[PDB]
UniProtKB/Swiss-Prot annotation, chain B:
The gene is Gria2. Residues 117-260 are extracellular. The modification Phosphoserine is found at residues 147, 181. The chain holds residues 414 to 796 of 883 of the full protein. This is Glutamate receptor 2. Palmitoylated. Depalmitoylated upon L-glutamate stimulation. Ubiquitinated by RNF167, leading to its degradation.
Length: 260, 260
């Protein structure tokens, strides 16, 4: 018999955001954003009812090196706490080994956010100076990229970041943004081009994405490995992509009401 | 035993090496997909035989007979174990075959003779002096055929009825037509092949406007093939090691045939 599908997601603008009047709203109505709209479209095409739930620990997902335990949305899927993740969850090798991913619904690359006027144009620029600190989000794919990289410039960046004091890592994108904005150009933030380009369109329009992306990947809808939901959701993603609905949702949440 | 790889002669993905007539087996061929096949096979631990698709087509389903041709057909009817080629991930194909996560991104794009007065798909659709078309039996044609997006629908209505036929059998042939058409023929093809051609003599073509859509190529296996899982992880591993980027830079490497 049909059950309500438990969707794990994360409060990350503009994917999932609290609606203005959330304090008097319940269930899915509390939220708005790209992934809220996407969940609606996927559910419609797949014919299921669902319940959006914000991941408890507020993390994307990393495996503890000691205990081998997955946290974040990946953990929610791995341990059977959610049926599907509809979020800016990056497709990675280590994750692909433990959960299923649809074909990508959005492309991104790691990128550099600076306060306007910062004399940085590239990862190479960052790696060759010490005046401007830089870091990444915790418990996500960007941090793991640097930790695992065998590419010289990135390995050099990781060697710096891992030991920098105070810590250059942040717990949320918002914290990284604030750090860039408040540091008078002495902090640059390594984040996905999607979030970077979003922030670039928000007041007070004091940040910008600089240089090319450091890699190329995408977000996928994730399900527990072997989940029967996987096939249908994947086709739904390709259909929506082909129909141009994904391009429409991107423009809607990034650019249509940009503030800059 | 020996994995049979179906692929297609398409520069710079798979090309006959100089003096190939005295070569044998896999050594006859060079290119991005040739190198990729080697890398995938090494990671997955299989021996393989590259074979060029008999009918020289990517893959389309005959409306009447509902039979698949091209590489898609070779997978569907058991003639090959895997396709390693610039084979576009699409909804209709995903229904009948398995695809790895993408190893390369692309979008449908416009190729014009330099100086042609066109900067967008919209421009093309709003005029009639410049003819335009696509490859036969491929994802670009099916995209326009299936599209409910206004401008693309208009372009299709024109293309389907244009006489003489605006469709071509091969990329080389569409490119020739652009060059020999004094600018009265624009070619719709994938950004990857467009950008490759853009950097080669006689440097008289160019990619204009943004891409009309966003998708990628995937390594394809028959539905439910056990090779699928390993090949998918291999793609992600190569991507994260930056080996896919290295391959792209190598085969799209600009020796400065045009300017510089
Ligand atoms: C987000 C759009 N999109 C739809 N799914 S896809 O055809 O598997 C794909 C592959 C890519 F390499 C880049 C984008 C992309
Ligand atoms: C081609 C590189 N690449 C690696 N495989 S992926 O992480 O599934 C992916 C998703 C995208 F949306 C765009 C590119 C991309
Ligand atoms: N999308 C990333 C989080 C953001 C980042 O790591 O930059 C992930 O899935 O882990
Ligand atoms: N990559 C395309 C062929 C080229 C095109 O259609 O423009 C396909 O898989 O069908
Ligand atoms: Cl300031
Ligand atoms: Cl071999
Ligand atoms: Cl439209
Ligand atoms: Cl008709
Ligand atoms: Cl011209």
């Amino acid at each position: 018999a049909n059950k309500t599908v438990v969707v794990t997601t994360i409060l990350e603008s503009p994917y999932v955001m609290m609606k203005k009047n959330h304090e008097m709203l319940e269930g899915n109505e509390r939220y708005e954003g790209y992934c809220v709209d996407l969940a609606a479209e996927i559910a419609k095409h797949c014919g299921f009812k669902y319940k959006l739930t914000i991941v408890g620990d507020g993390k994307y997902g990393a495996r503890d090196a000691d205990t081998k335990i997955w946290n974040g949305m990946v953990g929610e899927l791995v341990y059977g706490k959610a049926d599907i993740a509809i979020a800016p969850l990056t497709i990675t090798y280590v994750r692909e080994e433990v959960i299923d991913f649809s074909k990508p619904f959005m492309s991104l690359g790691i990128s550099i956010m600076i306060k306007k006027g910062t004399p940085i144009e590239s990862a190479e620029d960052l790696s060759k100076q010490t005046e401007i600190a830089y870091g990444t989000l915790d418990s996500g794919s960007t941090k793991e990229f640097f930790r695992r990289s065998k590419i010289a410039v990135f390995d050099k960046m990781w060697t710096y970041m891992r030991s920098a004091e105070p810590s250059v890592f942040v717990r949320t994108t918002a914290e990284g943004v604030a750090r860039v904005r408040k540091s008078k150009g002495k902090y640059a933030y390594l984040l996905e081009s999607t979030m970077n380009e979003y922030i670039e369109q928000r007041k007070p329009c004091d940040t910008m994405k600089v240089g090319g992306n450091l890699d190329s990947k995408g977000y996928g809808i994730a399900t527990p490995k072997g989940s029967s939901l996987g096939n249908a959701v994947n086709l739904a993603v390709l259909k929506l992509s082909e129909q141009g609905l994904l391009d429409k949702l991107k423009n809607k949440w990034w650019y249509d009401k940009g503030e800059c």
